[PDB]
Amino acid sequence: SQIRQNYSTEVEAAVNRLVNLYLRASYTYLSLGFYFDRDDVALEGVCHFFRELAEEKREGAERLLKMQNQRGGRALFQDLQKPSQDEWGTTLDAMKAAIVLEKSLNQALLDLHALGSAQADPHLCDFLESHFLDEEVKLIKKMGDHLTNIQRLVGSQAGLGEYLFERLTL
Amino acid sequence: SQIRQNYSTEVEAAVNRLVNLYLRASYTYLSLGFYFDRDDVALEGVCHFFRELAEEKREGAERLLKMQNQRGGRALFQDLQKPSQDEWGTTLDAMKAAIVLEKSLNQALLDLHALGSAQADPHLCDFLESHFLDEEVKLIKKMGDHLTNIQRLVGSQAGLGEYLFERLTL
Amino acid sequence: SQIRQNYSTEVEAAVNRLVNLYLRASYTYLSLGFYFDRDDVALEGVCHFFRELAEEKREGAERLLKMQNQRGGRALFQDLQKPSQDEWGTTLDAMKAAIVLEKSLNQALLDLHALGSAQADPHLCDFLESHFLDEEVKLIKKMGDHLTNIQRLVGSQAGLGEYLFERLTL
Amino acid sequence: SQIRQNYSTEVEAAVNRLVNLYLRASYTYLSLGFYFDRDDVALEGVCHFFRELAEEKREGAERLLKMQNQRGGRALFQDLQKPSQDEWGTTLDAMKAAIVLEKSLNQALLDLHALGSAQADPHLCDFLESHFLDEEVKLIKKMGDHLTNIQRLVGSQAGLGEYLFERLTL
C-alpha cells in the first residue's frame, strides 16, 4: 500500500479480530434487546438499554474499519457467531452477561494497545485511547451500578424489584 | 490593624476555629459523596445530596474568612483532620452521621454567637444570624425529614426502601 | 470489585496520595488568596488569581476521585496538612511559592504516569494526559511569565511595581 | 404619641445626635470632594469617591429620621458644624481623615446599639444591624485597602503615585 507506514501485519490482523468481536457484541445486544420486548418478558426499558448498545458496538466496529483503511491495512471479515444464549432470564441475568461481554472487549482492547506499544505504533495507541478505552471504563461502571441496584432490589420479591428498576432507572 | 474596631482577640480566634470546622465538614461531605458513587453502593441521588453540602460548607468557610478580613482579624489555618469514617454504611447511617455533624456546627455557631454577645459585638451577631443560624435550622429540619422517611421505608425490606428513597426523594 | 480490571493496587494507592496532594494545594491557594485580601496587603488581583487556583485544584481532586470510582478502586482520605506559611510576603514571594507547589504536583503527576506505564495501564496514562499533564504545563508557563514581569517591575521601587502588576496584569 | 411603644426618651435623643453626626459627615465629604476638584489639586477620581460618600451619609441621616418618625419620636435638629479642615492635603491625608471619621460614626452606631440593648429595644437593634453596622464595616475595609495602596505607592515619588492611584483604582 502506497500509504502504509509503521503499520505492522500483526496489528492489521488484530484490528480485524477486534472488528469481529465488536460485531459479535452488537449481535448479542440485538438479541438481548428483542428478548426483553417479548410479550412474556415485557421490560421495555431493559430492551432500549440493550438495543442502544447494539448500535454502540456496531459503530465501534465501523470506526475500527475506517481506521484500518486509514493506515493502509486490509479489512477481512469472518463469520459472526450467534449470541451465546437464546433466552436471557431476568434483568439481573442479562446485566451479568452484559458486563462479562464488556470486560472481554476491554481485555481485547487492552491486549491490542499492548501490541501497539510493543510495535511502537503510537497512532494506534492514541486511536484506542481516544475512542475506546475510556468509553469501556464508563460503560462497565454503569453496568456495575445497575447490577448493585438490581441486586439490592430483587431481595424478597424479585418481581416487584424488576418492574421498579425498569420503571425508575432505565 | 488600622481598621480593627470592637473586634476582640477571642472572637478572632473562634472565627478561625469555626473556619476549620466548616472545612472539616466540607471534607466529610466530599467523602460521604464519593462513597455513594462506588459501583457497589451506587445511589447517585445520595451522592448528589452530600456533594452539594460539601460545596455549601466550603462556601461557609470562605464567608467566615472574608468576614475575618473585613474586621481586621488574621486568618490562621490548621490541619484538616480526615472524615471520621472510610465507609458510611446505608443511606440511613449516612443521614444520621450528617445530622450529628450539622448539630455540632450549629452548637459551635451558637457558642460563637454567645461569645459575640458577651463581647458586645453586634456586627458578629448579625453576621452569624443572617448567613448561618437560619440555614443550619432549615438544613437540620430537612435531614430530620429525610431520616423519618428513610426509617419508615427501611422496614421489612431495607433494599427496596433505600432504592425508592433515592429514586423518589433525592 | 465486579468492575475492576487492569487496575493495580499500587495505582489505586497513588491516586489516593495524589488526591491528598491536590486538596493540599487547594488549601494553600485558599490561604494565599485570603492573605492578599488583608486590609494591610490589599492586592485584590493577586487574591483573585490564587482563589481561582484553589477552585482548580479542588476540581482536580474531585476528578481523580471520580476516576478512582470508575476503575473500581476505593477512595481513602487522609489529614490535610495546613499550608506551609501563615503570611506570604510580596506577590513575588507568593508567585515563587506557587511555582514550587505546581512543580511538585507536576512531578507527582509524572511519577504516577510512569507507574501506569510500568503497570501497563493505558487508561490511567490517557486519563492523566488529557486532564492534567498539559494543564500543569500551561499553568507553570503562566506563573513563569508572571515571575519575569514581577521581577522586571520590582526593581528600584517594589511598591509601585507590585501595584502596577496587580492593576495591569492580574 | 399614640403609636409610641417601647421607645425610650434616651434612644430618641441618641437617634437625634446620630442624625447630626451623619449630616456632619455628609458635609465633610462634600468639602473633601470639592477640594480635589480644585484646578490646583485636580484628582477627579478622588473627588467622585468623596462626593458619593457625601450622598451616602445624607441618606443615612434621612433613614434615621424616617425611623424616628416610625417609632413616634420627634426629630430635633441642631447646628451643623463645618468640616474640620479647609484644605485636605494629599489623597493619603484625605483617606486618613476619612477613616478617622468613619470609625467615629461606627463607634456612635455601636454605642447606640448598646443603648438599645440596655433599653431592651430589639427593633432599634435590628434597624441598626440591617442598614448601618455592616455597611460601616465594608466601608472602613475599603478605605483601609485604599490606604495600603496609597502608602505603597507614595514611596520614592508621591506625585506619580497619587496620579496612578487616582487613575487605576478610583
XYZ file of C-alpha atoms in Angstrom:
680
model
C 0.000 0.000 0.000
C 1.368 3.432 -1.035
C 0.237 4.996 2.262
C 1.092 2.223 4.733
C 3.677 3.383 7.269
C 4.654 1.947 10.679
C 1.604 -0.368 10.483
C 2.589 -3.948 11.275
C 0.849 -7.005 9.862
C 0.192 -8.168 13.461
C -1.792 -5.016 14.284
C -3.671 -5.240 10.987
C -4.651 -8.802 11.883
C -5.638 -7.848 15.441
C -7.757 -4.909 14.288
C -9.661 -7.377 12.095
C -10.256 -9.743 15.010
C -11.448 -6.822 17.110
C -13.886 -5.849 14.357
C -15.360 -9.352 14.524
C -15.549 -9.065 18.323
C -17.456 -5.783 18.134
C -19.923 -7.091 15.538
C -20.361 -10.170 17.730
C -21.170 -7.915 20.684
C -23.559 -5.834 18.587
C -25.337 -9.086 17.706
C -25.551 -10.237 21.334
C -27.099 -6.888 22.331
C -29.636 -7.073 19.495
C -30.669 -10.490 20.827
C -30.733 -9.226 24.431
C -32.880 -6.320 23.234
C -35.557 -8.240 21.407
C -35.781 -10.798 24.197
C -36.958 -8.137 26.670
C -39.508 -6.995 24.040
C -41.230 -10.409 24.172
C -44.835 -10.202 25.334
C -43.928 -12.639 28.149
C -40.899 -10.576 29.312
C -42.173 -7.068 28.563
C -39.493 -4.811 30.100
C -39.372 -2.024 27.515
C -36.664 -0.149 29.456
C -34.314 -3.140 29.505
C -34.963 -3.522 25.775
C -33.999 0.097 24.974
C -30.832 -0.231 27.080
C -29.521 -3.224 25.182
C -30.651 -2.029 21.753
C -28.730 1.213 22.186
C -25.608 -0.842 22.981
C -26.153 -2.881 19.823
C -25.848 0.430 17.952
C -22.815 1.483 20.032
C -20.932 -1.724 19.277
C -21.794 -1.559 15.565
C -20.373 1.953 15.365
C -17.292 0.774 17.258
C -16.663 -1.806 14.536
C -17.227 0.728 11.772
C -14.721 3.063 13.477
C -12.077 0.325 13.604
C -12.778 -0.380 9.931
C -12.283 3.246 8.912
C -9.044 3.356 10.887
C -7.887 0.156 9.184
C -8.399 1.815 5.805
C -6.686 4.999 7.011
C -3.488 3.065 7.862
C -3.421 1.106 4.575
C -4.484 -2.189 6.137
C -6.989 -4.538 4.537
C -10.315 -5.277 6.210
C -11.003 -9.031 6.288
C -14.358 -10.251 7.583
C -15.245 -13.587 9.191
C -18.406 -15.426 10.210
C -20.314 -13.836 13.081
C -21.155 -16.477 15.626
C -24.614 -16.220 17.142
C -25.167 -14.920 20.682
C -24.333 -17.356 23.459
C -27.976 -17.715 24.615
C -31.475 -17.759 23.118
C -33.262 -16.655 26.316
C -31.607 -14.283 28.776
C -33.501 -14.854 32.022
C -34.000 -11.884 34.313
C -32.658 -8.344 34.024
C -30.110 -9.440 36.634
C -29.040 -12.371 34.442
C -28.859 -10.085 31.398
C -26.824 -7.395 33.186
C -24.336 -10.024 34.409
C -23.870 -11.371 30.887
C -23.518 -7.815 29.534
C -20.710 -6.999 31.978
C -18.922 -10.265 31.149
C -19.083 -9.331 27.464
C -17.847 -5.775 28.058
C -14.923 -6.989 30.183
C -13.949 -9.268 27.299
C -13.983 -6.356 24.815
C -11.992 -4.275 27.318
C -9.364 -7.009 27.650
C -9.095 -7.301 23.862
C -8.756 -3.506 23.637
C -6.050 -3.601 26.286
C -4.340 -6.522 24.541
C -4.349 -4.588 21.248
C -2.980 -1.469 22.962
C -0.139 -3.557 24.395
C 0.615 -4.918 20.916
C 0.756 -1.371 19.539
C 3.103 -0.488 22.377
C 5.350 -3.441 21.521
C 5.207 -2.454 17.816
C 5.966 1.223 18.678
C 2.740 2.293 16.937
C 1.702 5.493 18.724
C -1.116 6.356 16.316
C -2.859 3.066 17.147
C -2.348 3.609 20.886
C -3.810 7.119 20.614
C -6.669 5.805 18.478
C -7.602 3.186 21.071
C -7.272 5.652 23.949
C -9.429 8.406 22.447
C -12.367 6.363 21.143
C -12.489 3.107 23.145
C -10.574 2.623 26.398
C -12.421 5.333 28.314
C -15.869 4.565 26.895
C -15.416 0.941 28.009
C -14.500 2.125 31.505
C -17.543 4.404 31.813
C -19.833 1.660 30.494
C -18.617 -1.137 32.749
C -19.081 1.298 35.665
C -22.716 1.967 34.717
C -23.399 -1.768 34.341
C -21.803 -2.261 37.758
C -24.028 0.483 39.211
C -27.092 -1.175 37.626
C -26.082 -4.600 38.973
C -25.820 -3.223 42.500
C -29.295 -1.705 42.257
C -30.899 -4.759 40.636
C -29.426 -6.951 43.388
C -30.496 -4.689 46.243
C -33.982 -4.730 44.647
C -34.509 -8.404 43.825
C -34.480 -9.337 47.504
C -37.753 -10.607 48.953
C -39.826 -10.052 45.775
C -37.806 -10.130 42.567
C -40.950 -9.431 40.522
C -41.640 -6.042 42.049
C -37.923 -5.215 42.005
C -37.508 -5.974 38.320
C -40.516 -3.785 37.463
C -39.351 -0.922 39.677
C -35.806 -0.997 38.287
C -37.082 -0.932 34.709
C -39.543 1.870 35.538
C -37.370 4.105 37.714
C -33.794 3.607 36.449
C -33.950 2.591 32.754
C -4.758 46.786 62.195
C -5.829 50.299 61.086
C -9.437 49.152 60.573
C -9.919 46.848 63.571
C -12.663 48.130 65.870
C -14.673 46.350 68.597
C -13.214 43.019 67.381
C -11.853 41.009 70.300
C -8.969 38.563 70.049
C -11.292 35.840 71.438
C -13.750 36.242 68.549
C -10.901 36.337 66.034
C -9.640 33.048 67.461
C -13.121 31.489 67.472
C -13.825 32.526 63.883
C -10.627 30.691 62.917
C -11.707 27.534 64.740
C -15.089 27.736 63.040
C -13.365 28.008 59.660
C -11.536 24.758 60.415
C -14.838 23.174 61.478
C -16.532 24.147 58.219
C -13.655 22.872 56.065
C -13.736 19.672 58.124
C -17.449 19.321 57.375
C -16.890 20.047 53.688
C -14.336 17.220 53.700
C -16.689 14.774 55.436
C -19.400 15.503 52.844
C -16.956 15.006 49.964
C -16.137 11.587 51.430
C -19.828 10.791 52.010
C -20.478 11.808 48.400
C -17.892 9.675 46.680
C -18.761 6.686 48.845
C -22.305 6.569 47.428
C -20.778 6.823 43.917
C -18.969 3.489 44.420
C -20.054 0.832 41.940
C -21.009 -1.374 44.925
C -23.125 1.362 46.603
C -24.482 3.124 43.514
C -27.016 5.601 44.955
C -26.447 8.583 42.664
C -29.101 10.659 44.471
C -27.454 10.214 47.872
C -24.157 11.176 46.234
C -25.529 14.451 44.799
C -27.078 15.336 48.173
C -23.823 15.075 50.074
C -21.663 16.611 47.346
C -23.840 19.717 47.290
C -23.335 20.036 51.064
C -19.578 19.756 50.579
C -19.893 22.880 48.412
C -22.199 24.575 50.951
C -19.768 24.044 53.815
C -16.793 25.213 51.733
C -18.601 28.449 50.922
C -19.496 28.827 54.599
C -15.793 28.756 55.461
C -14.934 31.219 52.709
C -17.653 33.563 54.034
C -16.213 33.432 57.558
C -12.780 34.130 56.070
C -13.976 37.207 54.189
C -15.664 38.474 57.343
C -12.454 37.899 59.304
C -10.595 40.102 56.830
C -13.380 42.703 56.919
C -12.989 43.124 60.708
C -9.169 43.339 60.609
C -8.609 39.879 62.071
C -5.970 37.481 60.791
C -6.944 34.173 59.205
C -4.898 31.300 60.666
C -5.289 27.830 59.174
C -4.744 24.434 60.811
C -4.559 20.811 59.694
C -7.831 19.372 58.414
C -8.450 16.046 60.058
C -9.855 13.358 57.791
C -13.515 12.304 57.951
C -14.438 10.069 60.865
C -15.200 7.027 58.650
C -13.944 5.429 55.432
C -17.213 3.615 54.618
C -20.578 5.115 55.536
C -22.944 2.140 55.533
C -26.510 2.731 54.412
C -28.260 5.972 53.493
C -29.796 5.754 56.972
C -26.332 5.508 58.549
C -25.101 8.407 56.402
C -28.089 10.643 57.207
C -27.617 10.008 60.945
C -23.946 10.970 60.750
C -24.827 14.056 58.676
C -27.300 15.298 61.295
C -24.774 14.702 64.090
C -22.254 16.796 62.158
C -24.743 19.598 61.465
C -25.810 19.753 65.122
C -22.142 20.164 66.035
C -21.727 23.084 63.595
C -24.963 24.592 64.942
C -23.694 24.365 68.523
C -20.397 25.992 67.528
C -22.345 28.734 65.723
C -24.477 29.240 68.814
C -21.387 29.212 71.039
C -19.753 31.873 68.842
C -22.921 33.993 68.881
C -22.926 33.838 72.683
C -19.283 34.953 72.733
C -20.139 37.911 70.493
C -22.978 38.732 72.861
C -20.604 38.639 75.837
C -18.097 40.788 73.884
C -20.876 43.248 72.855
C -20.045 42.643 69.177
C -23.325 43.257 67.339
C -21.825 43.067 63.847
C -20.665 39.496 64.519
C -24.060 38.545 65.968
C -25.813 39.982 62.903
C -23.313 38.254 60.615
C -23.986 34.861 62.193
C -27.752 35.401 62.188
C -28.064 36.446 58.541
C -25.842 33.841 56.872
C -25.667 30.811 59.199
C -28.080 30.305 62.098
C -31.192 30.037 59.937
C -29.593 27.974 57.165
C -28.475 25.459 59.811
C -32.030 25.281 61.152
C -33.572 24.676 57.715
C -30.943 22.039 56.909
C -31.232 20.043 60.121
C -35.013 20.041 59.532
C -34.613 18.576 56.032
C -32.202 15.915 57.324
C -34.747 15.130 60.040
C -37.496 14.844 57.403
C -35.260 12.528 55.334
C -34.444 10.391 58.390
C -38.134 9.909 59.135
C -38.795 8.782 55.566
C -35.740 6.513 55.344
C -36.779 4.851 58.616
C -40.414 4.381 57.627
C -39.078 2.837 54.382
C -36.333 0.508 55.604
C -38.849 -1.667 57.431
C -39.340 -5.185 56.085
C -37.029 -4.765 53.053
C -34.328 -2.142 53.507
C -33.038 -2.801 49.978
C -36.207 -1.733 48.217
C -36.629 1.173 50.642
C -33.154 2.550 50.042
C -33.684 2.414 46.263
C -37.122 4.025 46.458
C -35.923 6.828 48.740
C -33.005 7.613 46.439
C -35.271 7.486 43.366
C -38.323 9.350 44.655
C -36.990 11.848 47.228
C -33.364 12.702 46.316
C -14.898 -5.191 42.809
C -17.055 -6.601 39.966
C -15.834 -3.898 37.557
C -12.143 -3.685 38.486
C -9.923 -4.625 35.547
C -6.210 -3.955 34.903
C -6.205 -1.579 37.912
C -3.293 -2.353 40.222
C -3.323 -1.766 43.967
C -0.212 0.443 43.542
C -2.035 2.831 41.192
C -5.084 2.866 43.462
C -2.820 3.859 46.349
C -1.016 6.510 44.286
C -4.263 8.047 43.039
C -5.263 8.450 46.695
C -1.988 10.177 47.559
C -2.434 12.469 44.574
C -5.930 13.353 45.784
C -4.427 14.430 49.109
C -1.787 16.447 47.234
C -4.416 18.290 45.202
C -6.559 19.087 48.253
C -3.383 20.270 49.984
C -2.681 22.583 47.047
C -6.270 23.831 47.026
C -5.806 24.691 50.708
C -2.518 26.528 50.116
C -4.159 28.635 47.383
C -7.121 29.470 49.628
C -4.626 30.730 52.217
C -2.620 32.624 49.574
C -5.893 34.162 48.384
C -7.198 35.461 51.671
C -3.777 36.788 52.629
C -3.794 39.225 49.689
C -7.330 40.279 50.741
C -5.993 41.564 54.088
C -6.543 45.286 54.567
C -2.758 45.647 55.046
C -1.904 43.734 51.823
C -4.849 44.775 49.647
C -3.946 43.361 46.208
C -7.375 42.242 45.000
C -5.948 40.966 41.690
C -3.422 38.692 43.398
C -6.263 37.433 45.594
C -8.492 36.505 42.621
C -5.572 34.726 40.925
C -4.891 32.422 43.842
C -8.542 31.858 44.744
C -9.287 30.656 41.224
C -6.428 28.145 41.568
C -7.895 26.933 44.855
C -11.004 26.040 42.831
C -8.905 24.480 40.039
C -7.037 22.209 42.438
C -10.241 21.190 44.239
C -11.793 20.143 40.938
C -8.599 18.267 40.075
C -9.014 16.196 43.236
C -12.689 15.568 42.542
C -11.765 14.393 39.019
C -9.211 11.921 40.386
C -11.852 10.708 42.842
C -14.421 10.084 40.114
C -11.811 8.217 38.088
C -10.927 6.123 41.139
C -14.568 5.081 41.432
C -14.774 4.429 37.683
C -11.912 1.888 37.875
C -13.297 0.087 40.955
C -10.706 1.494 43.350
C -11.542 2.717 46.836
C -11.088 6.363 47.786
C -9.229 6.692 51.104
C -8.808 10.143 52.633
C -6.095 11.415 54.984
C -5.474 14.513 57.088
C -4.871 17.691 55.101
C -1.815 19.430 56.439
C -2.072 23.200 56.672
C -0.312 25.493 54.186
C 3.417 25.900 54.706
C 3.158 29.606 55.672
C 0.779 31.937 57.515
C 1.938 35.125 55.747
C 3.100 35.060 52.133
C 5.171 38.228 51.775
C 5.096 40.011 48.437
C 3.433 38.992 45.180
C 6.929 37.934 44.100
C 7.265 35.703 47.175
C 3.786 34.269 46.569
C 4.407 33.575 42.867
C 7.672 31.776 43.704
C 5.920 29.563 46.248
C 3.085 28.898 43.774
C 5.506 27.691 41.090
C 7.315 25.461 43.601
C 3.967 23.907 44.521
C 2.923 23.407 40.890
C 6.254 21.777 40.003
C 5.677 19.351 42.874
C 2.201 18.426 41.567
C 3.678 18.064 38.067
C 6.378 15.705 39.344
C 3.778 13.624 41.193
C 1.659 13.533 38.019
C 4.695 12.437 36.035
C 5.596 9.865 38.695
C 2.053 8.448 38.555
C 2.141 8.334 34.745
C 5.397 6.372 34.922
C 3.790 3.928 37.366
C 0.866 3.435 34.978
C 3.379 2.825 32.212
C 5.164 0.209 34.326
C 1.779 -1.368 35.204
C 0.697 -1.312 31.508
C -2.376 0.754 32.442
C -3.153 2.784 29.313
C -6.467 4.156 30.585
C -4.678 5.805 33.523
C -1.969 7.203 31.234
C -4.623 8.638 28.904
C -6.558 9.997 31.884
C -3.511 11.844 33.211
C -2.567 13.142 29.763
C -5.989 14.531 28.839
C -6.927 16.298 32.080
C -3.683 17.100 33.939
C -0.267 16.953 32.267
C -0.975 19.711 29.752
C -2.881 21.974 32.148
C 0.103 21.815 34.523
C 2.428 22.795 31.677
C 0.307 25.787 30.629
C -0.023 26.925 34.250
C 3.648 26.718 35.178
C 4.349 28.727 31.997
C 1.945 31.498 33.044
C 3.453 31.606 36.548
C 6.881 31.815 34.914
C 5.667 34.683 32.701
C 4.262 36.458 35.785
C 7.516 35.942 37.711
C 9.520 37.523 34.903
C 7.242 40.565 34.875
C 7.103 40.934 38.666
C 10.913 40.791 38.785
C 11.442 43.285 35.972
C 8.991 45.556 37.852
C 10.186 45.317 41.454
C 13.480 46.985 40.579
C 14.076 50.434 42.054
C 10.620 50.760 43.684
C 8.978 47.448 44.526
C 5.908 49.266 45.878
C 4.958 50.882 42.596
C 5.827 47.685 40.718
C 3.613 45.487 42.861
C 0.676 47.881 42.397
C 1.206 48.165 38.643
C 1.490 44.396 38.174
C -1.709 43.794 40.132
C -3.511 46.572 38.226
C -2.299 45.907 34.685
C -1.678 42.136 34.503
C -3.968 40.411 37.052
C -47.631 59.824 70.761
C -50.460 57.344 70.008
C -48.039 54.940 68.290
C -45.002 55.176 70.582
C -44.212 51.817 72.178
C -41.024 50.539 73.865
C -39.193 53.649 72.570
C -37.244 55.317 75.368
C -36.515 59.033 75.544
C -32.775 58.186 75.719
C -32.864 56.386 72.357
C -34.933 59.182 70.823
C -32.285 61.657 71.969
C -29.418 59.478 70.711
C -31.026 58.967 67.304
C -31.161 62.764 67.000
C -27.477 63.117 67.867
C -26.644 60.430 65.327
C -28.614 62.329 62.684
C -26.447 65.381 63.366
C -23.333 63.188 63.147
C -24.352 61.813 59.754
C -25.165 65.258 58.336
C -21.817 66.442 59.705
C -20.094 63.590 57.871
C -22.024 64.324 54.682
C -20.750 67.904 54.944
C -17.130 66.836 55.485
C -17.300 64.606 52.386
C -18.792 67.416 50.291
C -15.827 69.574 51.324
C -13.351 66.739 50.672
C -14.971 66.288 47.257
C -14.801 69.841 46.016
C -11.253 70.232 47.295
C -9.996 67.520 44.919
C -11.903 69.282 42.094
C -9.727 72.400 42.518
C -7.708 73.227 39.415
C -4.550 73.015 41.576
C -5.452 69.566 43.016
C -7.241 68.053 40.016
C -7.806 64.419 41.067
C -11.252 63.798 39.582
C -11.318 60.201 40.876
C -10.685 61.249 44.478
C -13.433 63.845 44.049
C -16.022 61.284 42.862
C -15.112 58.956 45.746
C -15.781 61.531 48.430
C -18.829 63.058 46.744
C -20.519 59.665 46.595
C -19.923 59.297 50.351
C -21.486 62.710 50.928
C -24.626 61.246 49.330
C -24.311 58.012 51.348
C -24.108 59.859 54.656
C -27.018 62.153 53.750
C -29.200 59.137 53.019
C -28.062 57.566 56.291
C -29.389 60.601 58.157
C -32.657 60.564 56.231
C -33.061 56.859 57.099
C -32.568 57.553 60.811
C -35.109 60.371 60.516
C -37.736 58.134 58.926
C -37.153 55.534 61.629
C -37.518 58.218 64.302
C -40.926 59.113 62.883
C -41.876 55.432 62.610
C -41.312 54.914 66.364
C -43.212 58.068 67.407
C -40.099 60.027 68.355
C -39.601 63.684 67.498
C -36.820 64.778 65.158
C -34.863 67.705 66.633
C -32.176 69.360 64.521
C -29.061 71.245 65.639
C -26.389 73.402 64.021
C -24.091 71.559 61.627
C -20.518 72.418 62.429
C -18.270 72.951 59.429
C -15.710 70.343 58.346
C -12.561 70.184 60.444
C -10.283 71.431 57.618
C -10.411 73.840 54.674
C -7.661 72.108 52.655
C -7.181 68.345 52.808
C -3.610 67.823 51.615
C -2.858 64.688 49.634
C -5.102 61.736 48.819
C -3.231 59.953 51.617
C -4.099 62.752 54.057
C -7.725 62.710 52.885
C -8.069 58.919 53.166
C -6.658 59.007 56.715
C -9.154 61.677 57.752
C -11.984 59.735 56.072
C -11.188 56.571 58.040
C -10.991 58.543 61.300
C -14.442 59.964 60.562
C -15.921 56.565 59.672
C -14.523 54.963 62.837
C -16.230 57.720 64.824
C -19.598 57.024 63.144
C -19.058 53.294 63.739
C -18.391 53.881 67.440
C -21.518 56.036 67.729
C -23.506 53.315 65.936
C -22.099 50.729 68.321
C -22.798 52.993 71.303
C -26.415 53.421 70.158
C -26.803 49.663 69.645
C -25.569 49.095 73.200
C -28.114 51.624 74.487
C -30.893 49.796 72.635
C -29.651 46.574 74.190
C -29.761 48.134 77.662
C -33.259 49.519 76.910
C -34.415 46.102 75.561
C -35.333 47.732 72.231
C -34.935 44.949 69.660
C -36.447 46.907 66.769
C -33.734 49.565 67.125
C -31.006 46.912 67.351
C -32.336 45.221 64.204
C -32.637 48.595 62.473
C -29.002 49.453 63.186
C -27.796 45.985 62.189
C -29.601 45.813 58.841
C -28.855 49.285 57.463
C -25.687 50.556 59.188
C -23.351 48.270 61.138
C -22.372 46.126 58.160
C -22.129 48.983 55.656
C -19.724 50.744 58.041
C -17.613 47.587 58.251
C -17.410 47.159 54.465
C -16.568 50.847 54.012
C -13.817 51.058 56.614
C -12.313 47.946 54.969
C -12.258 49.609 51.536
C -10.692 52.770 52.993
C -8.114 50.542 54.685
C -7.418 48.795 51.360
C -7.039 52.202 49.659
C -4.702 53.447 52.408
C -2.445 50.428 51.965
C -2.228 51.033 48.219
C -1.718 54.799 48.502
C 1.099 54.195 51.002
C 2.820 51.510 48.943
C 2.602 53.964 46.006
C 3.718 57.255 47.549
C 7.206 55.896 48.174
C 10.020 57.466 46.163
C 7.765 59.730 44.044
C 4.475 60.636 45.697
C 3.443 62.658 42.630
C 3.429 59.728 40.242
C 1.849 57.508 42.902
C -1.029 59.872 43.572
C -1.773 60.128 39.835
C -1.563 56.369 39.305
C -3.813 55.601 42.280
C -6.436 58.076 41.086
C -6.215 56.733 37.516
C -6.075 52.991 38.171
C -8.041 52.440 41.407
C -10.633 55.248 41.737
